[PDB]
Amino acid sequence: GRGNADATFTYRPSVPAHRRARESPLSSDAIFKQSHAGLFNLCVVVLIAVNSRLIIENLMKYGWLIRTDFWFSSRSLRDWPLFMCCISLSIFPLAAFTVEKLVLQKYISEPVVIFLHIIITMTEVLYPVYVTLRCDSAFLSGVTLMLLTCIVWLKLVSYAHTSYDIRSLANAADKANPEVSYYVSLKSLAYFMVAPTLCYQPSYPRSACIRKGWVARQFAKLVIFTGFMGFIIEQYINPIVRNSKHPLKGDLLYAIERVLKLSVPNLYVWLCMFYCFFHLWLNILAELLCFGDREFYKDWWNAKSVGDYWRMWNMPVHKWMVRHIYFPCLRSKIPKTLAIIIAFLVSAVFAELCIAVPCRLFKLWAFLGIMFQVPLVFITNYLQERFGSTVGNMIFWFIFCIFGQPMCVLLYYHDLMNRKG
Amino acid sequence: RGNADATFTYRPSVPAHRRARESPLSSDAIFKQSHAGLFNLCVVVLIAVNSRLIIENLMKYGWLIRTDFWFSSRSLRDWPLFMCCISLSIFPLAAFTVEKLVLQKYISEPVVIFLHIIITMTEVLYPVYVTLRCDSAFLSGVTLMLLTCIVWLKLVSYAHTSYDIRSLANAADKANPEVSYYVSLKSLAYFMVAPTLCYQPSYPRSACIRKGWVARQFAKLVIFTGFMGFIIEQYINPIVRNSKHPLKGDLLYAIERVLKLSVPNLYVWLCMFYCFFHLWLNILAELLCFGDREFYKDWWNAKSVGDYWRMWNMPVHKWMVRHIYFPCLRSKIPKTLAIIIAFLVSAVFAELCIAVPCRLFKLWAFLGIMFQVPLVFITNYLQERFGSTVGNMIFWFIFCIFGQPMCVLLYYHDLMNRKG
Ligand SMILES: CCCCCCCC/C=C\CCCCCCCC(=O)SCCNC(=O)CCNC(=O)[C@H](O)C(C)(C)COP(=O)(O)OP(=O)(O)OC[C@H]1O[C@@H](n2cnc3c(N)ncnc32)[C@H](O)[C@@H]1OP(=O)(O)O
Ligand SMILES: CCCCCCCC/C=C\CCCCCCCC(=O)OCC(COC(=O)CCCCCCC/C=C\CCCCCCCC)OC(=O)CCCCCCC/C=C\CCCCCCCC
Ligand SMILES: CC(C)(COP(=O)(O)OP(=O)(O)OC[C@H]1O[C@@H](n2cnc3c(N)ncnc32)[C@H](O)[C@@H]1OP(=O)(O)O)[C@@H](O)C(=O)NCCC(=O)NCCS
Ligand SMILES: CCCCCCCC/C=C\CCCCCCCC(=O)OC[C@H](CO)OC(=O)CCCCCCC/C=C\CCCCCCCC
Ligand SMILES: CCCCCCCC/C=C\CCCCCCCC(=O)OC[C@H](CO)OC(=O)CCCCCCC/C=C\CCCCCCCC
Ligand SMILES: CCCCCCCC/C=C\CCCCCCCC(=O)OC[C@H](CO)OC(=O)CCCCCCC/C=C\CCCCCCCC
Ligand SMILES: CCCCCCCC/C=C\CCCCCCCC(=O)OC[C@H](CO)OC(=O)CCCCCCC/C=C\CCCCCCCC
Ligand SMILES: CCCCCCCCCCCCCCCC(=O)OC[C@H](COP(=O)(O)O)OC(=O)CCCCCCCCCCCCCCC
Ligand SMILES: CCCCCCCCCCCCCCCC(=O)OC[C@H](COP(=O)(O)O)OC(=O)CCCCCCCCCCCCCCC
Ligand SMILES: CCCCCCCC/C=C\CCCCCCCC(=O)O
Ligand SMILES: CCCCCCCC/C=C\CCCCCCCC(=O)O
Ligand SMILES: CCCCCCCC/C=C\CCCCCCCC(=O)O
Ligand SMILES: CCCCCCCC/C=C\CCCCCCCC(=O)O
Ligand SMILES: CCCCCCCC/C=C\CCCCCCCC(=O)O
Ligand SMILES: CCCCCCCC/C=C\CCCCCCCC(=O)O
Ligand SMILES: CCCCCCCC/C=C\CCCCCCCC(=O)O
Ligand SMILES: CCCCCCCC/C=C\CCCCCCCC(=O)O
Ligand SMILES: CCCCCCCC/C=C\CCCCCCCC(=O)O
Numbered sequence: 001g002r003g004n005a006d007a008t009f010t011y012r013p014s015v016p017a018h019r020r021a022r023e024s025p026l027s028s029d030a031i032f033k034q035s036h037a038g039l040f041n042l043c044v045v046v047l048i049a050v051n052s053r054l055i056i057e058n059l060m061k062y063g064w065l066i067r068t069d070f071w072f073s074s075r076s077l078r079d080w081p082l083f084m085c086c087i088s089l090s091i092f093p094l095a096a097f098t099v100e101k102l103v104l105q106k107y108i109s110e111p112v113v114i115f116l117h118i119i120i121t122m123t124e125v126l127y128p129v130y131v132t133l134r135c136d137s138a139f140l141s142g143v144t145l146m147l148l149t150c151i152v153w154l155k156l157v158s159y160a161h162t163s164y165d166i167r168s169l170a171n172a173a174d175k176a177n178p179e180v181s182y183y184v185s186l187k188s189l190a191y192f193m194v195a196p197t198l199c200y201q202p203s204y205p206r207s208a209c210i211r212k213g214w215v216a217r218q219f220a221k222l223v224i225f226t227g228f229m230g231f232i233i234e235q236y237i238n239p240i241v242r243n244s245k246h247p248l249k250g251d252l253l254y255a256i257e258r259v260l261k262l263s264v265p266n267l268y269v270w271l272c273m274f275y276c277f278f279h280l281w282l283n284i285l286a287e288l289l290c291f292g293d294r295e296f297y298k299d300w301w302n303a304k305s306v307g308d309y310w311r312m313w314n315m316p317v318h319k320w321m322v323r324h325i326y327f328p329c330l331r332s333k334i335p336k337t338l339a340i341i342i343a344f345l346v347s348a349v350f351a352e353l354c355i356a357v358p359c360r361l362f363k364l365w366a367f368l369g370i371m372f373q374v375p376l377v378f379i380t381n382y383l384q385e386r387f388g389s390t391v392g393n394m395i396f397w398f399i400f401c402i403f404g405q406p407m408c409v410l411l412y413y414h415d416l417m418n419r420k421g
Numbered sequence: 422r423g424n425a426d427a428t429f430t431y432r433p434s435v436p437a438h439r440r441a442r443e444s445p446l447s448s449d450a451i452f453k454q455s456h457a458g459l460f461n462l463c464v465v466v467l468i469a470v471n472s473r474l475i476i477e478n479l480m481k482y483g484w485l486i487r488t489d490f491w492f493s494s495r496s497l498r499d500w501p502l503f504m505c506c507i508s509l510s511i512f513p514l515a516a517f518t519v520e521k522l523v524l525q526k527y528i529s530e531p532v533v534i535f536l537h538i539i540i541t542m543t544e545v546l547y548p549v550y551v552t553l554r555c556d557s558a559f560l561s562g563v564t565l566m567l568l569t570c571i572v573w574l575k576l577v578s579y580a581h582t583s584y585d586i587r588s589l590a591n592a593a594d595k596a597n598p599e600v601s602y603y604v605s606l607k608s609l610a611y612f613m614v615a616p617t618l619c620y621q622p623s624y625p626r627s628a629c630i631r632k633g634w635v636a637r638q639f640a641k642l643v644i645f646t647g648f649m650g651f652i653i654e655q656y657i658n659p660i661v662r663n664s665k666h667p668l669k670g671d672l673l674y675a676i677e678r679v680l681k682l683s684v685p686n687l688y689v690w691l692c693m694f695y696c697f698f699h700l701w702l703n704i705l706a707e708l709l710c711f712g713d714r715e716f717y718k719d720w721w722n723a724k725s726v727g728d729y730w731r732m733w734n735m736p737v738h739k740w741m742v743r744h745i746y747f748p749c750l751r752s753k754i755p756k757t758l759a760i761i762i763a764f765l766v767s768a769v770f771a772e773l774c775i776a777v778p779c780r781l782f783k784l785w786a787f788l789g790i791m792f793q794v795p796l797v798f799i800t801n802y803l804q805e806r807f808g809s810t811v812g813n814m815i816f817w818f819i820f821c822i823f824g825q826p827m828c829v830l831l832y833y834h835d836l837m838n839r840k841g
Pocket of ligand 14 (some may be wrong): 486491646647648649651653841
């Protein structure tokens with residue numbers, strides 16, 4: 001035919017076929033200086049075949065498990081006592097604003113301000129916890145209420161500390177510009193409480209305008225990916241978790257097989273959760289509010305260790321811990337390792353709150369898992385220095401996406417089922 | 422930052438937002454740097470999936486390895502076949518006798534083609550009758566039929582190359598070399614055991630024989646052959662035993678069985694290539710001091726099916742180019758019919774190798790080799806349309822996930838259907 005090789009002018013069989021002594025491939029170091037694209041294309045083809053076999057085997061065993069009443073039903077008893085609390089979480093920054101105005105005119109002293117701030121933040125933590133504990137609602141409503149409570153707590157602590165620092169620099173060094181209009185101050189606080197950031201500033205860099213078609217397109221992608229995530233949770237995660245036993249009570253091999261079976265759709269749900277929250281929703285929120293800065297994350301998938309992942313997975317939380325926990329501890333002559341223990345302790349307490357308060361279980365799995373990250377940072381740093389970056393990134397994937405999250409899902413689900421009966 | 426080290430402390434009055442930036446996935450300037458974490462994620466998911474398959478098979482079945490699966494009461498199969506493998510040696514000596522009988526001007530030139538036809542058909546038909554008469558295992562008859570194909574390719578190559586040298590020497594009318602009978606017999610004897618299919622009076626030679634190198638390659642050959650036996654016994658056998666015919670049951674069940682079987686089948690095929698085409702041929706070339714050792718190329722980077730067929734097996738490719746392609750081109754046969762002739766020879770010999778030990782007459786392997794001609798024409802077009810990556814992926818999907826497990830299931834269930 002056409003031919004993608006040497007020309008077709010005939011040489012006779014009396015002409016020899018062997019004239020030079022060569023050497024076979026994979027028997028010399030010259031094979032390493034060549035691109036082997038097919039060896040990764042083979043892995044991609046094997047992955048597609050494996051996932052296709054899993055889909056066909058799950059469909060043959062179970063069938064269509066999708067129901068119209070699984071996610072959103074007519075049980076609206078969960079809605080009204082907690083969503084009202086969601087609106088009732090907006091009275092705590094205004095109270096804080098009143099305290100700040102009380103120190104702006106010379107009416108009260110500084111320790112009274114710190115004591116009042118502790119009262120407002122503590123009441124803000126304790127009241128939704130009591131509301132969620134007294135009622136009986138779904139998991140999702142409680143998770144949403146706890147996440148909003150944690151975000152409002154971080155904003156209040158950041159606003160109070162940054163306002164004290166601005167007041168302390170404006171009173172000590174040089175006194176200028178006294179008594180700025182209450183409406184501009186209320187507008188800045190109200191703008192900060194809805195913006196996609198956790199650090200308070202009086203003003204922020206802005207963008208051009210609102211692109212309505214862009215916001216509509218990102219919203220359409222967000223609803224499609226959320227529906228895809230719900231389908232993967234209902235059709236694939238639910239059979240595996242119903243058909244298991246407790247991992248700490250039973251055979252070891254059976255528990256390892258259940259964790260390895262749960263590892264793949266959990267990883268898919270994790271990537272979809274990151275793309276839905278940290279990319280789509282924050283950009284839609286920034287576009288509506290004309291928020292200029294949009295560095296909400298970095299390339300965390302190229303992490304060379306556990307500490308690399310914790311440095312680049314979440315930009316607002318990392319900037320909040322650097323500004324409000326790490327640097328005040330460093331200024332007070334405390335060592336570095338104590339600062340990493342205090343920061344991970346704050347993270348472990350709030351993660352334990354968000355997971356355990358809807359579940360109504362005092363099992364400290366999530367607390368121990370966040371608190372175990374402190375020796376893991378040093379161990380993966382030593383391993384990455386000794387062995388390289390590829391082996392460090394593989395150790396990070398094995399620890400995070402293969403072992404930890406399915407084990408947490410199985411422990412919390414089975415503890416909840418043992419609580420109910 | 423990088424490892425563990427602090428930074429001086431700033432203050433919260435300093436703003437943390439001073440520039441208006443965009444997200445990493447909001448721009449097309451994201452592929453400039455290396456995203457090595459995705460490749461590592463694919464490797465980690467593959468290792469986890471393989472470990473789950475090993476643990477699930479071990480929990481379901483247990484240890485299935487037996488001490489008498491391969492070598493147990495083999496004297497009924499070893500005595501007639503291995504003797505027939507020694508009996509194949511008289512077929513070069515006949516052809517050599519015919520060459521000497523035309524070299525001394527005792528018989529004419531049309532008689533030698535007829536005599537070569539009698540020698541080649543007798544050499545093919547005698548092991549077929551010996552394999553079909555006395556009952557034996559599959560692995561003892563596969564070896565005999567593969568030596569029946571290799572000795573037929575060497576005899577056809579020797580006859581054609583000898584005729585071409587004689588036809589060249591006839592038109593010159595001068596003969597200064599005078600090769601003795603011992604030297605010609607030594608050349609033919611060296612050709613029959615060398616790792617090549619193309620006849621030459623002499624070849625480039627190697628320096629010497631390295632004993633430690635031969636011992637190391639032989640040790641690797643024993644370890645990898647044992648690994649192949651363990652994969653076939655422990656994993657391929659329970660999948661193949663608990664299944665049905667692919668055109669008898671439900672379609673979803675058949676697709677699930679082929680996709681289940683396709684993962685250890687790939688390991689057996691790559692291990693088979695590494696054991697034969699790399700280890701054994703180099704050991705044979707080292708013991709025989711054979712210089713040329715390019716027995717293959719990098720076929721795993723092929724962008725189409727025709728690319729794979731061009732670089733999977735160097736002796737068979739040189740034999741098809743020298744003995745089937747260029748004589749067809751010299752005789753004004755069209756270029757699209759020589760491909761059909763070459764694939765026809767390969768399909769007949771492949772169908773013979775799978776069907777004579779199995780004792781079945783079903784053309785699964787024959788039609789599979791003969792379907793590669795429209796596959797070559799389609800994949801060249803898809804390669805030109807969509808690129809080398811898509812072409813290589815189509816090659817991997819067609820060969821490793823669909824063709825070979827379906828062929829294994831069809832031949833097994835047809836064999837079990839015959840035996841009852
Ligand atoms: C719609 C799809 C649906 C799904 C799919 C359904 C069907 C699936 C079916 C099945 C899947 C599985 C398939 C098998 C898997 C296992 C394989 C094994 O390893 S098992 C061992 C058994 N195999 C054998 O017994 C064969 C042995 N035969 C050969 O290896 C030969 O080499 C053969 C017949 C393949 C001939 O091919 P050449 O490439 O070696 O040689 P030439 O035909 O002479 O030339 C081809 C090309 O060579 C170049 N060429 C031409 N002249 C050249 C020259 N002088 N020098 C170099 N190259 C030259 C040109 O590119 C030419 O192109 P131009 O085909 O005409 O388009
Ligand atoms: C809601 C409204 C909020 C607005 C608030 C106002 C301003 C915002 C303010 C400030 C900026 C915010 C940033 C600050 C903090 C936030 C980040 C945060 O806190 O969490 C984020 C995320 C994280 O979840 C994870 O699990 C990942 C954790 C990482 C892995 C950890 C585990 C592994 C560890 C160890 C391994 C174990 C090894 C041990 C030993 C081994 C042996 C050695 O959770 C979600 O929220 C995702 C939810 C899922 C997606 C739902 C849909 C998403 C779309 C929309 C929702 C709204 C749509 C409205 C549409 C209306 C019309 C329809
Ligand atoms: C706590 C968190 C900030 C991680 O950071 P951390 O290591 O604990 O503490 P810091 O942010 O103060 O320091 C991070 C690193 O940056 C380094 N660093 C120091 N100064 C820095 C600076 N100016 N900028 C950036 N990094 C800096 C630190 O040395 C540290 O490396 P180290 O850990 O070896 O000390 C945060 O990303 C986190 O872990 N959150 C968890 C939230 C969570 O678990 N929620 C539930 C999930 S389901
Ligand atoms: C990333 C790699 C995988 C991507 C490839 C996905 C395609 C592979 C193929 C095939 C499925 C083949 C079966 C076709 C469906 C009809 C079978 C039938 O006639 O039976 C009747 C029965 C009666 O009920 O069913 C139905 O009507 C059909 C309902 C089921 C459709 C589900 C399709 C969703 C597929 C993929 C989702 C993507 C996420 C992957 C998650 C993987 C987790 C393990
Ligand atoms: C650390 C990185 C590797 C990541 C792979 C995931 C490993 C998960 C599994 C298992 C460890 C199992 C060994 C613990 C033994 C104690 C359990 C017990 O008490 O009972 C023993 C039981 C008798 O009842 O069984 C046995 O005696 C031996 C069990 C053998 C199973 C080993 C298979 C899984 C481990 C590794 C596979 C790695 C190869 C993958 C290569 C793929 C390349 C693409
Ligand atoms: C005894 C007198 C008779 C006359 C002389 C006999 C010698 C004739 C032959 C041969 C030397 C071979 C030279 C030709 C090179 C081209 C080979 C070829 O073109 O054939 C390719 C083949 C079929 O197409 O491709 C395959 O896939 C084969 C897959 C087999 C993999 C099985 C793993 C074990 C590998 C090798 C056997 C172990 C060595 C023996 C050691 C044990 C000693 C008792
Ligand atoms: C002169 C000597 C010749 C040497 C020839 C052979 C050398 C290499 C050989 C063989 C295979 C051995 C590898 C396994 C190690 C022995 C296991 C053992 O100690 O004895 C079994 C014991 C009772 O005796 O207990 C058990 O059964 C539990 C252990 C089973 C472990 C299986 C590990 C499989 C590893 C990789 C397979 C990768 C393929 C995955 C494909 C999945 C597709 C479905
Ligand atoms: C009991 C928990 C309290 C939670 C927080 C309460 C509200 C905080 C509001 C702060 C407002 C400014 C106050 C005065 C600032 C000052 O004098 O000056 C600023 C100082 C540090 O002074 P320097 O900057 O001079 O070193 O800030 C701090 O000491 C803390 C800053 C805010 C971060 C609080 C984080 C809370 C969680 C702590 C770890 C976990 C709990 C540990 C105990 C069990
Ligand atoms: C149109 C249909 C053609 C046949 C199709 C089926 C072919 C099956 C495979 C066998 C033939 C392979 C090629 C052999 C010929 C060649 O290389 O070459 C055939 C040659 C080529 O001559 P040129 O080089 O001058 O073109 O034709 C000749 O007349 C020269 C004399 C050759 C004498 C020795 C031939 C080989 C002897 C042993 C095998 C005999 C035939 C067995 C047939 C079953
Ligand atoms: C079904 C009870 C809750 C199960 C645990 C859920 C834990 C939170 C994780 C993901 C839930 C949010 C993403 C999926 C929502 C899909 C909604 C929908 O498809 O309509
Ligand atoms: C409403 C009736 C059914 C209730 C049980 C629903 C299933 C609960 C089981 C598992 C939920 C898993 C939630 C998502 C896990 C991934 C989270 C992550 O990766 O961070
Ligand atoms: C023999 C050892 C048994 C170990 C039992 C406990 C295993 C670890 C359980 C949970 C680890 C933490 C889970 C992931 C981090 C916390 C939860 C989260 O934020 O998603
Ligand atoms: C009202 C209860 C109905 C039944 C339970 C439905 C809720 C599912 C609850 C817990 C499952 C998941 C908890 C563990 C989450 C860990 C997140 C992660 O994987 O990182
Ligand atoms: C069709 C395949 C071609 C032939 C390949 C098989 C060769 C068989 C020879 C030896 C296999 C021995 C199997 C050893 C199993 C593992 C033993 C062990 O683990 O102790
Ligand atoms: C029936 C006797 C006992 C069972 C013996 C084994 C049965 C399995 C049958 C066929 C599987 C052959 C596996 C290897 C074939 C080559 C794979 C390949 O070409 O890629
Ligand atoms: C010692 C050799 C072992 C070989 C094991 C092979 C397993 C598969 C069995 C039969 C497939 C035969 C394929 C024949 C290919 C072409 C033969 C040829 O033309 O030389
Ligand atoms: C899409 C369904 C198509 C069904 C087709 C059924 C026909 C099966 C024919 C060929 C299958 C594979 C045979 C080729 C592999 C050859 C192996 C070898 O040469 O040794
Ligand atoms: C008494 C002996 C009974 C039979 C022994 C075991 C036979 C296994 C043989 C045949 C099944 C097919 C083998 C592989 C052929 C297809 C090769 C391929 O597709 O590449």
